[PDB]
């Protein structure tokens, strides 16, 4: 009953099971630990970062090793459009003979790989199960390096100080230039040297790379300035990927669009992209001042940025010390940027597939988009939660105020009511009218008169599609016109490739849109606005409100303030995160439902099914869920089973976890404490069991813990059931 | 970089004078015990108790390897594979083309014998109050003192004799595995070569 929460003496003195539960959930909140200083905080965070990167590299190495050992990578190379990639083998003693037979792939039961790693590794120039093994070996070596570094930087003479950790200019210069630019430069080097010849049949391994010229002229044009030579003779339109037939000699080109065979971006396009990004980031990494008297001091930049007329208060004067001294502000900024970035990855890796033969891998396309959108929602909610935490525990009004006037951040708490009221107005506006139009379509179609539907053509979005060259909406605007200056300017660089790809019905590049797209985009906007409303309200109201003008004194996460003053359930800022998680899950569900139904109709060919039935709710319920759930639920029946049996089991498992979350959310404490007391009496008053007694007094889960557990069940069930549905439906419908 | 100190003066390494002399074995033992208590206090890790137990097991296993070689040579060690219909799909190793290669029955029998011996060990582990030599160290008990580079030359059924023979057997197993890995033959093939041919005859 002691010594487990070593970091908290208050918990270690708890005589109940709450100590164990809270010991888990407070282990990473280093700022709240006993005998805590800032130096130890930054050093522990640094070591934890090292361990985390080691974990990531070990996970990647495991994926590589299992593809190399139990996969069919080599067979998939020779026939990427017919051979289904294998993730890893299965050894489960609970299998019957039927399950073994159904999951049997080649030599052993195995799982199909939906991560798209086969296409990614094939694109970057891997052709052998020994290339994957080398990658796994190297990644385990890197993990060992990172673990050694993490141990080393906790040693006495190697523990960095607060000044080093808060040295913003040095870290920015190095991160930008070194990390981004130099990693892009090295990736361009690999892309060219290995990937470009490997796509043309020439093997460039760790033996013949110092003697195989990536370009026939060989670094002469680069120093000579004849950089056009690297773009001459690109890959033809009859080039077979991985073979020298119809190949070229160029390494950096503009082509635009996709490879005619793999239906993916040109490797020479991506090498040029990464070279340009490398140059730009290396240049941008010299901005801030270091030991050589030139550069920028960001404190001065922030302080000097006050509009002269005066509408942002005193400007950004106090922001430098605010961000530097708070790890939650930086964490929130990083999480918001990462969420936007992974939303970008999801939205671009389906419209512009970058890996060979990934466009025809429909289950992996759906899985990748869903995975990245869910990660995006999680990251955004985390960014807002950490902003709220910064408000609660790191924000100092004195730093952000100069002689009564407030800086740009402190002024966000002055018109907080205006911000929240207008977020509420936008949410109500969008919800009222999107639901009104959807229900109008529902009722009108149900009454057998679909012509009375309200169908709004998304002209604004179709205008953008025409601006990028789509000649489908008869707009003749910028790139849909051959005479506009936008078209004449790039008529010789990348329009022929771009136009040939955007004006193609088999791509996902700028999918044609209609009224259903309009309505679902408005639903998405409503979801985004409502999630933002909850999170922003929790962040701004974190330090106090009218119901609790001292909420900052109770911390970020506390159960309530009691039944007084009318009742104060879910009044903390943590509860705002807890409520906004449901809205994030709902919004990501809407986004992924829209994406998956649109792409299922596109792949099956019945795009008229979406364009007609997507305007009313029953259309969704009947033609997406009810229609495509048939292959999934018949993964095992009283007659047999298929390789989709695991997905049906996961479907039911997700439903069960969802409803257990419903348990933990609807039923609150107090009802579970008295029942536990009855159980305690029963155990204490029964023979043959009195010999065994608990060391920690069994008590009901706390209010905040119960909310967390219900949210965890809700989210896990949500994710599992939707993953099972999307994967099984795609597999069982599209062969 | 220049206007500040990367490492504070208050956080600097101090040379541990407590390990002066203290040959690498004593230094390693002290470092392990200080760094990992509650597993060192149990006798686990680089400890004389663990060394003695592992030596006993290595000697018994040299005996077991000789017995296994004899059984393989003398027509024992049942033939074929396990019945998947009888023992489920967990005994299936691979399916090449329409035939299920299962775990060899000889491997199953050897695993059952090893299970017998390991069960005996587990009973002795959860029988601490009735066994002559316990597996772990009692709280308070102190680990027997390391024997050193060369244990005392005391012939017979002595602690030093068992210690020396356990070290020799463990080194022999290490050498056997190293020879098998370097040259590439089976473990029993290496033992057969190292016995002239008198085992697999």
């Amino acid at each position: 009953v002691y010594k487990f929460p070593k970091f908290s003496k208050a918990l270690a003195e708890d005589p109940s099971t709450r100590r164990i539960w809270y010991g888990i959930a407070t282990a990473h909140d280093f700022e709240s630990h006993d005998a805590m200083t800032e130096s130890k905080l930054y050093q522990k965070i640094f070591a934890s970062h090292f361990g985390h990167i080691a974990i990531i590299f070990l996970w990647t190495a495991g994926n590589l090793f299992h593809v190399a050992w139990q996969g069919n990578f080599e067979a998939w190379i020779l026939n990427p459009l017919k051979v289904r990639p294998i993730a890893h083998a299965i050894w489960d003693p609970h299998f019957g003979q039927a399950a073994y037979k159904a999951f049997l792939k080649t030599s052993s039961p195995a799982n199909l790989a939906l991560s798209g790693v086969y296409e990614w590794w094939y694109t970057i120039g891997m052709r052998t199960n020994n290339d994957l093994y080398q990658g796994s070996f190297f990644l385990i070596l890197l993990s060992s390096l990172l673990l050694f570094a993490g141990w080393l930087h906790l040693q006495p003479s190697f523990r960095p100080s607060l000044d080093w950790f808060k040295a913003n200019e040095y870290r920015l210069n190095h991160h930008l230039s070194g990390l981004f630019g130099v990693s892009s430069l090295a990736w361009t080097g690999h892309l060219v040297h290995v990937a470009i010849p490997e796509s043309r049949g020439i093997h460039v391994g760790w033996d013949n790379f110092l003697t195989v010229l990536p370009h026939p002229e060989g670094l002469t044009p680069f120093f000579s300035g004849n950089w056009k030579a690297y773009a001459q003779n690109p890959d033809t339109a009859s080039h077979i990927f991985g073979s020298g037939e119809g190949s070229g000699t160029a390494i950096l080109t503009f082509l635009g669009g996709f490879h005619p065979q793999t239906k993916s971006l040109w490797l020479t396009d991506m090498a040029h992209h990464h070279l340009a990004i490398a140059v730009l980031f290396i240049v941008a990494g010299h901005m801030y001042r270091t030991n050589w008297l030139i550069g920028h001091q960001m404190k001065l930049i922030l302080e000097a940025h006050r509009p002269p007329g005066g509408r942002l208060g005193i400007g950004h004067i106090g922001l430098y010390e605010t961000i530097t001294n708070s790890l939650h502000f930086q964490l929130g900024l990083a999480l918001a940027a990462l969420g936007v970035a992974t939303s970008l990855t999801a939205q671009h890796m389906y419209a512009l597939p970058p890996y060979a033969f990934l466009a025809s891998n429909f289950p992996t396309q759906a899985a990748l988009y869903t995975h990245h959108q869910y990660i995006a929602g999680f990251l955004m909610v985390g960014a807002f939660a950490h902003g709220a935490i910064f408000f609660v525990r790191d924000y100092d009004p004195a730093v952000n105020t100069r002689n009564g006037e407030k800086n740009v951040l402190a002024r966000m708490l002055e018109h907080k009511e205006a911000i929240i009221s207008h977020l509420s107005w936008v949410s109500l506006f969008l919800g009222f009218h999107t639901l009104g139009i959807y229900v109008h379509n529902d009722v009108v179609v149900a009454f057998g008169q679909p012509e009375k539907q309200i169908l709004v053509e998304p002209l604004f979005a179709e205008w953008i599609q025409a601006a990028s060259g789509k000649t489908l909406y008869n707009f003749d605007l910028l790139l849909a016109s051959s005479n506009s200056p936008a078209s004449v300017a790039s008529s010789q660089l990348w329009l022929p490739g771009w136009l040939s790809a955007i004006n193609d019905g088999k791509n996902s590049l700028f999918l044609p849109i209609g009224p259903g797209d309009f309505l679902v985009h408005h639903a998405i906007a409503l979801g985004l606005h409502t999630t933002t409303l909850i999170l922003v309200k929790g962040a701004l109201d974190a330090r106090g409100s009218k119901l609790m003008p001292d909420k900052k004194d109770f911390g970020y996460s506390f159960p309530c303030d009691g039944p007084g003053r009318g009742g104060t359930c879910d009044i903390s800022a943590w509860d705002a995160f807890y409520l906004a998680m449901f809205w994030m899950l709902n919004t990501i569900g809407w986004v992924t439902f829209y994406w998956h139904w649109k792409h299922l109709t596109l792949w099956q060919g019945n795009q008229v099914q979406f364009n007609e039935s997507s305007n009313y709710i029953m259309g969704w319920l009947r033609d997406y869920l009810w229609l495509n759930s048939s292959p999934l639920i018949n993964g095992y029946n009283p007659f047999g089973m298929n390789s989709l049996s695991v997905w049906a089991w996961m479907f039911l498992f997700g439903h069960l976890v969802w409803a257990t979350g419903f348990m933990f959310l609807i039923s609150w404490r107090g009802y579970w404490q008295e029942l536990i007391e009855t159980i305690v009496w029963a155990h204490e008053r029964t023979p043959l069991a009195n010999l065994v007694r608990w060391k920690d007094k069994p008590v009901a889960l706390s209010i905040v813990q119960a909310r967390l557990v219900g949210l965890a069940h809700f989210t896990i069930g949500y994710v599992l059931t939707y993953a099972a549905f999307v994967i099984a439906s795609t597999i069982g419908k599209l062969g | 970089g220049t206007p500040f100190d990367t490492v504070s003066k208050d956080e600097l390494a101090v040379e541990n004078k407590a390990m002066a002399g203290k040959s690498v074995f004593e230094r390693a033992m002290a470092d392990f015990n200080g760094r990992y208590p509650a597993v060192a206090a149990l006798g686990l890790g680089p400890s004389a108790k663990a060394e003695r137990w592992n030596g006993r097991h290595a000697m018994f296993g040299w005996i077991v390897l000789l017995a296994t070689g004899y059984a393989q040579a003398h027509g024992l060690l049942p033939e074929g594979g396990m019945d998947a219909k009888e023992w489920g799909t967990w005994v299936i190793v691979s399916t090449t083309n329409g035939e299920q290669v299962t775990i060899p029955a000889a491997r199953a029998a050897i695993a059952i014998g090893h299970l017998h011996f390991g069960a005996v060990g587990v009973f002795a582990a959860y029988s601490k109050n009735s066994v002559k030599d316990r597996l772990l160290l009692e709280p308070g008990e102190k680990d027997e003192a390391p024997a050193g580079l060369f244990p005392a030359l005391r012939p017979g059924l002595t602690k030093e004799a068992e210690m020396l023979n356990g070290r020799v057997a463990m080194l022999g197993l290490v050498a056997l595995v190293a020879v098998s890995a370097a040259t590439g033959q089976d473990i029993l093939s290496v033992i057969d070569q190292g016995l002239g041919g008198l085992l697999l005859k």
Binding site: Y133, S144, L154 | -
Partner: peptide
């Protein structure tokens, strides 16, 4: 198909990465 030697040494290297992980884990304290 990878050999027994390839998998074995990868397992051995994985063990070394494990001992480095507990050293980091124990250094981040109990």
């Amino acid at each position: 198909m990878i050999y027994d030697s390839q998998v074995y040494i990868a397992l051995v290297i994985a063990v070394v990465a494990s001992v480095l992980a507990i050293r980091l884990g124990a250094t981040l304290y109990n």
